Design a binder for this molecule. Structure first.
Ligand SMILES: NC(=O)c1ccc[n+]([C@@H]2O[C@H](COP(=O)([O-])OP(=O)(O)OC[C@H]3O[C@@H](n4cnc5c(N)ncnc54)[C@H](O)[C@@H]3O)[C@@H](O)[C@H]2O)c1
Ligand SMILES: NC(=O)c1ccc[n+]([C@@H]2O[C@H](COP(=O)([O-])OP(=O)(O)OC[C@H]3O[C@@H](n4cnc5c(N)ncnc54)[C@H](O)[C@@H]3O)[C@@H](O)[C@H]2O)c1
Ligand SMILES: NC(=O)c1ccc[n+]([C@@H]2O[C@H](COP(=O)([O-])OP(=O)(O)OC[C@H]3O[C@@H](n4cnc5c(N)ncnc54)[C@H](O)[C@@H]3O)[C@@H](O)[C@H]2O)c1
Ligand SMILES: NC(=O)c1ccc[n+]([C@@H]2O[C@H](COP(=O)([O-])OP(=O)(O)OC[C@H]3O[C@@H](n4cnc5c(N)ncnc54)[C@H](O)[C@@H]3O)[C@@H](O)[C@H]2O)c1
Lengths: 265, 259, 268, 268
């Protein structure tokens, strides 16, 4: 009798064993959920990663910049979960920003074509994914996306921070549109986790030192501490929002960051 | 194997079976928790209300303005749950503001003695309850308080809104202090609920419910505290172990929309 | 001895005499500023509008999506104000979102190509205008952009609200970059004003529909605003921009100043 | 013809020539304002400080915890400025929290009687001063109070931070009530300034401890501020208050203006 027992959940965003989406999937399966996974581009590599999950799960290709993939997504999910079955949850764990829009590269020097690609993948696709999956979502379902607190400007995060500001805004509109079908939409703002998309912050670096400083500053501010090597608290928080225990929460951000956002040293 | 199986949780704030705390207690017991209840002033009446809960629970007297009640609270909890057993959760569901501080009474005319009493009960006591219970809380425990979004001024709520603004600030400092013991602290900001404390602020509840329901993408029912109670239990569980110092909105999404 | 006496200020975004930028320019000139204006696309029409201002001002073409326009902007400004002279203020009063992204079209139906154009013009260009003008800005100068409070989702405004959320984030990074030059960057969040850009929320409305929607919009804003709100009066917004362009807020950067009657601070 | 020429402004909160209120008063007088000053407790000492100001100003006693002082304040102001004359601005620059509630004392150890005294002086009195002065305020006037950003918990500031969170909420209600008179109400959130009130955060410090803590405070603020921060320079803060007292932000009420070098907008 797990937290997500019998729920059918779409999980995007696995690329390595460090991906936040891998741990969301792992924790969700251990909580009784039946998963459908999506992967971008390197499907054979992503299947090798998914094979280390607790349980088997169908894997569908999804490039969120590809209109055909999005137009066929609901039908392909239905083939994976069985005719007449619907999804109970959707996890958006997708982000990207070209190197010109991040790290030591100057903020003013990022060409808009690069910024627009990052905003397409990191913010607009939260709406795109919701539009594609809502037709096959049960009433009372839950859509969850991954956020990194963009309330204040930060070194290195640069245009990804801008994309997250846009994502938070998109989430409020997705909440409005999904609410008619009784579906909730929320973001989890995680503290920093050692992942690929996080390594994009260090770029062509000294890389360990920057990560150590990042983790140390975050840990010091967090009243309960912060471990960049431990994605599990973040995965659990996503599962809490996918469960039935927060049924009047939508359009919001839940902070899984050790409390670091609420303190000023 | 419930959400709160085996957890020992202190629940303050029951006065009627409409109290948000009554439904927190009901949902928590149905989720496997063992409760200790507190009550203010009318102990026999509160016990009759607590008798309507799914399961029995010891009831302790607590007036949060009474220093002696607070200083002895941990010892009395230990007597109720057994020495060596510790609390896993504490629920603050306590609020009050004199009528001069609310309603049609002009905001400028509330005397400070009345405002100060309301801030004592509604905001400062979140810190005093935490100080009183943290000595017997387990690592990984959870303190949860009840909030009403004070980000913008509202008709009628007046100084209670100010008290909630103070409570949100207090919550961040309680998170800091409780964090050393591995204990989390968070608030649940509920939409309006038909309770005694709500009634004190004001047909008028019908207009409030209508506007809140309209703005909420998933709707809002002022007569249904269960979604709020469930949200409190989510924060009392082990499923949000990196969340502290924050506000979780159980308001139908109304705070995120502008009609 | 006006508020902006002797200051050289670039003002973008005039298209008609209802434009918020027209009133920023008018009030700034009346406060002693010497302006350089920019215009997009309809240069002869915009010049005729600029002719209605209190004082003459050179007009430069600037399409913020045009890389060549941005790359030559500082040189063309220098040609207008004199080589080696510097700007004290820059006003970004530029916004656009295609009808697929705002108004009656469903939120989910906006194609990304359209959203991206709106975000380019409405949010990214705050950064590219800063990049283009900072080389000729005086230490202690001021960059100001126009915002519409995107903290909560709103009907009709849709992807323009998303773009303003991005703009607020961009503003904090522009503040970081411009701060190295001692230059401030801030946004003014205005209440609704009857302009071409704001009429985008009623695109396609027939008969009495546009007037009614505008009446409800103004009434709700006025009701929430403790000091009221008049959608036909851009002057309070223009004055607020001039306040940020002045020397009277020299420690304010990276923030949003609300010129909205206080409506954002109240919940009816 | 200064920014505040001919305006009559009440300035509370002078105790020394380091007081933020002293510099608000100095800058406002240099901008043409006619001031009425108030002081708490040490009236003879405060007069000697006021003697150091550019221009003469009447000084009235005001303990904001004293009902009689508040009830007579408008009549005593009328006596200073002439019967039937009105104030254009009111500046609240008043704050206090006992040492049990701020500095090195543990957060959990503050008795409520002490916290309540601090909230009375630091937050409630913003409402009480507005109530006392609004009867003699011009339509379109301006009330400004001093804030220290309490969005996030901070070491040492402790219950003063809670009081400022309450003050921000009080400001939104004062804006609602004052709006009926056309009067604006706003807070200026200042960065740290070396004053008596700010020294409370190091109460009891010995040897080099106070200086070390003040250096870390300034260095952290200056590092986060894109335009820097100097704790010895209250003038940018004073200017910002004067900007809000002016006629240049006439649609702004219920809000917080950050005069903090931008530090609140950045995360290192
Ligand atoms: N790691 C952190 O510090 C941190 C903190 C907060 C939020 N996040 C967010 O969590 C989410 C997951 O990132 P992660 O840290 O697990 O990194 P990751 O690199 O493991 O995951 C990013 C995922 O985005 C996917 N993606 C990229 N382009 C795509 C496209 N066109 N279509 C579909 N998928 C595409 C990648 O394939 C990858 O699976 C992202 O939104 C990220 O911004 C990360
Ligand atoms: N009902 C709503 O609309 C609403 C909205 C959001 C949040 N809240 C908050 O939820 C909490 C619970 O209130 P409610 O709506 O259930 O109303 P309620 O009247 O049922 O509960 C308030 C409780 O506070 C207790 N209390 C008062 N003074 C006390 C004191 N000195 N010591 C100890 N306890 C004392 C009362 O005895 C009562 O049990 C409050 O903090 C309230 O502000 C209520
Ligand atoms: N009017 C309102 O209700 C309101 C409220 C808050 C903020 N704003 C903002 O105020 C600013 C000015 O808009 P307005 O209301 O005065 O409307 P407007 O239509 O008068 O001005 C918009 C301006 O944007 C310019 N523009 C569009 N595309 C451009 C491009 N590629 N390059 C350069 N300029 C381009 C247009 O030419 C026009 O001059 C905008 O950012 C708008 O979003 C408006
Ligand atoms: N200095 C800072 O770092 C800083 C930063 C942000 C905001 N502030 C705020 O600025 C305001 C002015 O403080 P300051 O830093 O100039 O310090 P200060 O010690 O010079 O001023 C505090 C003033 O409060 C007055 N006061 C105390 N109790 C009073 C009472 N009962 N009645 C009337 N007045 C009373 C004192 O007499 C004194 O004049 C305060 O609200 C303070 O919290 C200060």
């Amino acid at each position: 009798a797990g937290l997500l027992e019998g729920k059918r959940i779409l999980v995007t965003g696995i690329i390595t064993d460090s991906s936040i989406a891998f741990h969301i999937a792992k924790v969700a399966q251990e909580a009784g959920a039946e998963l459908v996974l999506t992967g971008f581009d390197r499907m054979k590599l992503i299947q090798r990663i998914a094979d280390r999950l607790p349980k088997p799960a169908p894997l569908l290709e999804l490039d969120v910049q590809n209109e055909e993939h999005l137009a066929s997504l609901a039908d392909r999910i239905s083939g994976a979960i069985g005719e007449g079955n619907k999804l109970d949850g959707v996890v958006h764990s997708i982000g990207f920003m070209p190197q010109t829009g991040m790290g030591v590269n100057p903020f003013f020097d990022a060409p808009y074509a690069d910024v627009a690609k990052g905003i397409h993948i990191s913010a607009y696709s939260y709406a795109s994914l919701a539009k594609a999956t809502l037709p096959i979502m049960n009433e009372g379902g839950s859509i969850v996306g991954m956020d990194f607190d963009p309330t204040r400007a930060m070194p290195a995060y640069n245009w990804m921070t801008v994309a997250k500001s846009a994502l938070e805004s998109v989430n409020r509109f997705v909440a409005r549109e999904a609410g008619a079908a009784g579906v909730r939409s929320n973001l989890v703002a995680a503290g920093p986790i050692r992942t690929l998309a996080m390594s994009a912050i260090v770029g062509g670096a000294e890389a360990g030192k920057q990560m150590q400083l990042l983790e140390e500053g975050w840990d010091q501010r967090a009243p309960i501490g912060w471990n960049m090597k431990d994605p599990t608290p973040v995965a659990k928080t996503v599962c809490a929002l996918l469960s039935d225990w927060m049924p009047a929460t939508t359009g919001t951000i839940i902070y899984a960051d050790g409390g670091a956002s609420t303190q000023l040293l």
